[PDB]
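Predict the assembly for these two chains.
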Amino acid sequence: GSMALFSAQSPYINPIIPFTGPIQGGLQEGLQVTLQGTTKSFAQRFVVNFQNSFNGNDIAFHFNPRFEEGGYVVCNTKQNGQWGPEERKMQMPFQKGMPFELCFLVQRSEFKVMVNKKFFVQYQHRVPYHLVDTIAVSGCLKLSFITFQTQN
Amino acid sequence: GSMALFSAQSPYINPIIPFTGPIQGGLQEGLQVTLQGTTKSFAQRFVVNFQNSFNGNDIAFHFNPRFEEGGYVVCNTKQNGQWGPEERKMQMPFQKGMPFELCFLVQRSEFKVMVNKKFFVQYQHRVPYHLVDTIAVSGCLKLSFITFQTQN
């Protein structure tokens, strides 16, 4: 709970960072992509990208925690190799050397992002989400698994 | 051989069927769960379930030999009380009234299943395996022991 959830595809178990893998069928409404991992002890930044294809030219949603200037998270979109206007959440919900549950929920108008079961940010779709078929994870973290679940 | 193996937990010796017991720490990669037993002389079916908790609502892997319509084995997953698509191995590697060695090996992407030291089926993880902390065995069999071993 509070929702019943079903595997939408097989989990990636102990993925090695940097990780690039498919989201099979592309992102769909109601999908929860959950990353369970550990922020490194001397982390500077990490990145979770939801993107069309392996190139990283088109990133629907770039999630970029930065342990800099007090701690903040950047959310942005990249189109045809070009970054849009950043959305800076002036708070750091991750902690160096500590385990986290990072969950991305795909609604029709926005992504909702949960860190450790608590709501952290919303990010409104700038481009269509069904065109995302790739998750790329890199930077100062370790991961223990990634799950893909739906309410259907 | 061909591998050196170490107890990952104490064996269950002469467990009484139906049997429900813990997998301590949950399933982990490289674990071999070995059931040594006897198929009854008038067996219809038996079941080995790897599940989260005692309720049987969430069965990561359901292993269900059926001495029906020529003999076949069902492998399936149950989530939130709901069965997924079955995987039917159209072969029966058990024999009525006869002893068997049933061995389940946990790899990162799949379970490998050995019957009598020979490979029988593979079953790809539909849900994470570390969440399994319970083995449930029931149906038309007797067991002499269950072992849990790792290569570590």
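The longest strand of chain A covers residues 141-150. The two ends of chain A are 14 Å apart (CA to CA).
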